[PDB]
Amino acid sequence: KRLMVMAGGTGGHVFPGLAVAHHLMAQGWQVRWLGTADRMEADLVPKHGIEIDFIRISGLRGKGIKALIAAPLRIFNAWRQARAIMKAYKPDVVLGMGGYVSGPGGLAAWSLGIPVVLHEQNGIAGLTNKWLAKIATKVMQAFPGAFPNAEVVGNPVRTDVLALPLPQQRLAGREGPVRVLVVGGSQGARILNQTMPQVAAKLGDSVTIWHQSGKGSQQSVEQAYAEAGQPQHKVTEFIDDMAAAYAWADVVVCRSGALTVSEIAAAGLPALFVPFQHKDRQQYWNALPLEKAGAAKIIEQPQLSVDAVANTLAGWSRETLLTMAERARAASIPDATERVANEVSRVARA
Amino acid sequence: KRLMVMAGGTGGHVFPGLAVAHHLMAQGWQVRWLGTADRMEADLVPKHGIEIDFIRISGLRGKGIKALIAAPLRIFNAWRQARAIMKAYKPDVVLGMGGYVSGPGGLAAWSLGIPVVLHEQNGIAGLTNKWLAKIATKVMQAFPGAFPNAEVVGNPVRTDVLALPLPQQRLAGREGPVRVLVVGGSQGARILNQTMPQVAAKLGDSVTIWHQSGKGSQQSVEQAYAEAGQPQHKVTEFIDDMAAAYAWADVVVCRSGALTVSEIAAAGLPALFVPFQHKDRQQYWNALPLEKAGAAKIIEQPQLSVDAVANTLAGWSRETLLTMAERARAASIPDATERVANEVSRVARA
Ligand SMILES: CC(=O)N[C@H]1[C@@H](OP(=O)(O)OP(=O)(O)OC[C@H]2O[C@@H](n3ccc(=O)[nH]c3=O)[C@H](O)[C@@H]2O)O[C@H](CO)[C@@H](O)[C@@H]1O
Numbered sequence: 001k002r003l004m005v006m007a008g009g010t011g012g013h014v015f016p017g018l019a020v021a022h023h024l025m026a027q028g029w030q031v032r033w034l035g036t037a038d039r040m041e042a043d044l045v046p047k048h049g050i051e052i053d054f055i056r057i058s059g060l061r062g063k064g065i066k067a068l069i070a071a072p073l074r075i076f077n078a079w080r081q082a083r084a085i086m087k088a089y090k091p092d093v094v095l096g097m098g099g100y101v102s103g104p105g106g107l108a109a110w111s112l113g114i115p116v117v118l119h120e121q122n123g124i125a126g127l128t129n130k131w132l133a134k135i136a137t138k139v140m141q142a143f144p145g146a147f148p149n150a151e152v153v154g155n156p157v158r159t160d161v162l163a164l165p166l167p168q169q170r171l172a173g174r175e176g177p178v179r180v181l182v183v184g185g186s187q188g189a190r191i192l193n194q195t196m197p198q199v200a201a202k203l204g205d206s207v208t209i210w211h212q213s214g215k216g217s218q219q220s221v222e223q224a225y226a227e228a229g230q231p232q233h234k235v236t237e238f239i240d241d242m243a244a245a246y247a248w249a250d251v252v253v254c255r256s257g258a259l260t261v262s263e264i265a266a267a268g269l270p271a272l273f274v275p276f277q278h279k280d281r282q283q284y285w286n287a288l289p290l291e292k293a294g295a296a297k298i299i300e301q302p303q304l305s306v307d308a309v310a311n312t313l314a315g316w317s318r319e320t321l322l323t324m325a326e327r328a329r330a331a332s333i334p335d336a337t338e339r340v341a342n343e344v345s346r347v348a349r350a
Numbered sequence: 351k352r353l354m355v356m357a358g359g360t361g362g363h364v365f366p367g368l369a370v371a372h373h374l375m376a377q378g379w380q381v382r383w384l385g386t387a388d389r390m391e392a393d394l395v396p397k398h399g400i401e402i403d404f405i406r407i408s409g410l411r412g413k414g415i416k417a418l419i420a421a422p423l424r425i426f427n428a429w430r431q432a433r434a435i436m437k438a439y440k441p442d443v444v445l446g447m448g449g450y451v452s453g454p455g456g457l458a459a460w461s462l463g464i465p466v467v468l469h470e471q472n473g474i475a476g477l478t479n480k481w482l483a484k485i486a487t488k489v490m491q492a493f494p495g496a497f498p499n500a501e502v503v504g505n506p507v508r509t510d511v512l513a514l515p516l517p518q519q520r521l522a523g524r525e526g527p528v529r530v531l532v533v534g535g536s537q538g539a540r541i542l543n544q545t546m547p548q549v550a551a552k553l554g555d556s557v558t559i560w561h562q563s564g565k566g567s568q569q570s571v572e573q574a575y576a577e578a579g580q581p582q583h584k585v586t587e588f589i590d591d592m593a594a595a596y597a598w599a600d601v602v603v604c605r606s607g608a609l610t611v612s613e614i615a616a617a618g619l620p621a622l623f624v625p626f627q628h629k630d631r632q633q634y635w636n637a638l639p640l641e642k643a644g645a646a647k648i649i650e651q652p653q654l655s656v657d658a659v660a661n662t663l664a665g666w667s668r669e670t671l672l673t674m675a676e677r678a679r680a681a682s683i684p685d686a687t688e689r690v691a692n693e694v695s696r697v698a699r700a
């Protein structure tokens with residue numbers, strides 16, 4: 001049994017993919033990757049012991065479907081190239097995780113009669129996934145609403161976060177300033193870098209903060225905190241030991257990218273989500289479940305202010321937090337990785 | 351508003367299409383037809399006062415499923431024209447009846463985001479419809495079992511048959527010899543042309559027969575009736591007024607072609623179905639619904655014998671016959687043309 005994972009461009013699509021792959025390789029599967037050379041998967045996949053065939057999707061990047069409907073020809077090359085790869089690798093099934101490289105590969109798998117399985121990581125169906133679903137054999141999504149009748153299996157979660165102790169054990173008799181973790185996605189978010197320091201001035205000693213500013217802002221965010229009179233807080237450009245940071249925290253203030261959301265849930269951590277501002281409210285839809293489950297609270301730009309932030313924090317006792325942490329863990333889907341690996345296997349057995 | 355109807359070259363595909371097209375044109379809709387120039391529709395549709403655009407689908411007819419998986423480019427030009435024409439006409443929705451053309455035009459309408467509506471005439475789907483049914487917005491079938499669970503709508507039935515009185519009105523009160531109508535599709539069936547004469551020799555004066563022999567076999571069958579010593583029976587090559595014959599019959603012995611079945615059901619007639627012997631067993635499936643309701647009885651060629659027919663006929667009393675007629679009608683879908691037309695309209699509005 002052979003499999004070809006189709007994902008690239010961002011870690012949002014690549015990491016959940018590598019996770020499902022390694023999982024099936026341990027089951028004896030032969031996995032091969034379909035990506036693009038000028039992008040992230042080019043260097044990452046190899047370091048995972050998975051071969052990767054490349055194709056070029058030049059004038060295919062940033063296409064709004066009306067551009068594809070308007071001009072099909074553009075996808076014809078990649079389609080051709082993909083059919084070639086699968087002509088040679090004879091995959092039993094293909095797994096699309098989203099991203100531009102997923103369009104050609106999906107169409108190709110489908111034209112050859114090879115079953116195509118799809119995983120959507122966000123609350124709002126992305127680029128190719130929206131139109132690629134049409135020719136899919138099975139669709140799965142992380143949270144509800146991306147697609148009408150699609151199974152909710154959640155996002156595969158990084159191992160180090162899955163090994164975190166449950167809330168109870170973690171918050172067992174904790175005392176002192178609420179440990180506040182601030183995270184702005186892998187890049188960092190200006191909004192948090194400029195808001196949290198002022199929130200520190202208002203809460204003062206009621207909290208101890210660990211602030212992740214993103215590359216090139218550590219010095220900036222640090223100085224802001226000092227000028228607010230709270231020099232003791234810790235600022236980091238990028239936290240490598242994300243899991244330990246999660247385990248240390250009482251609560252988290254952060255953007256709501258899909259994986260971060262899933263991780264917080266699996267980690268059982270109270271959250272105050274500050275969704276990225278966009279007409280699609282993707283980030284907003286990624287956090288809804290944890291909120292609707294009563295484990296967090298969302299604040300879009302409309303209601304985002306220094307006070308609303310400090311206000312929301314001052315009201316969560318360690319009692320509430322402990323309650324929110326369990327609601328988060330209960331609302332999580334830790335075994336997402338196998339849930340997808342199994343559906344793929346399931347379709348494999350025609 | 352504007353609709354593109356796609357029907358191959360064959361009565362089963364065009365007549366149902368024509369019916370629906372006429373129904374919509376009477377409701378304002380503008381209709382365009384897509385077919386071939388070397389097939390039946392390249393003469394009939396124009397006569398029904400409808401515009402028809404042709405497309406070369408030569409290197410497409412004959413080749414099967416795996417034949418297309420191997421040579422995807424074969425349907426390229428067809429798609430070229432199919433799509434091209436739909437840009438110059440701009441359909442709001444397309445209806446595929448089943449013919450070859452059905453494919454190219456469907457792929458085109460699909461690649462243009464134009465909704466696709468499909469209708470299957472037989473209990474078992476043809477080539478094009480089988481696959482074309484994956485990129486369809488709505489799927490309909492005359493009989494159950496041609497597709498997973500498409501909405502059963504039946505087949506459009508010729509007006510002159512619909513205009514018939516109900517079974518009760520014309521069957522109760524009849525006395526004397528049972529009227530047997532022997533029909534063998536629009537071409538006549540050799541097997542019935544040989545069996546019936548013997549059946550008559552065995553049934554004698556208990557029945558009066560009207561036998562439709564198909565073109566070029568009138569004298570042959572007549573002579574055969576002469577042998578049995580039953581010269582009185584009527585033998586016709588092709589009954590022009592099928593309605594009068596149906597209304598006359600007390601029972602029918604015939605083939606199970608899709609349209610003929612819908613006619614028998616709407617007319618409310620008891621039947622002895624002798625499916626066209628074939629590997630796909632298409633005609634067998636077309637007849638099953640009537641048997642399941644006990645409105646008819648089936649006998650495939652393999653089990654077909656002079657005596658099975660005679661005994662079967664001998665066992666049907668004048669009273670039970672009127673019950674079968676009642677359930678035949680009760681199991682018919684008189685308003686197919688309207689259901690399909692409505693679905694087409696329903697979809698179009700979006
Ligand atoms: C452009 C934008 O608005 N953001 C998008 C971006 O989020 P973004 O990529 O910025 O955040 P994601 O959820 O994607 O990824 C975060 C990942 O980085 C890790 N991490 C983060 C910070 C840190 O200091 N250390 C660390 O290890 C987290 O554990 C997690 O694994 O991609 C997501 C899809 O995946 C989308 O849902 C977001 O909408």
Ligand SMILES: CC(=O)N[C@H]1[C@@H](OP(=O)(O)OP(=O)(O)OC[C@H]2O[C@@H](n3ccc(=O)[nH]c3=O)[C@H](O)[C@@H]2O)O[C@H](CO)[C@@H](O)[C@@H]1O
Pocket residue numbers: 360361362363508533534535536537562587588589590592605606607608609610611613
């Ligand atoms: C050419 C050929 O070999 N088969 C054709 C034949 O199959 P076939 O004969 O099997 O078609 P069907 O049984 O589905 O339809 C029969 C139709 O012919 C009418 N009828 C039949 C006998 C008669 O004497 N008078 C009469 O008017 C019936 O009322 C009915 O409307 O018709 C189909 C529908 O047109 C075509 O798709 C097929 O290509």
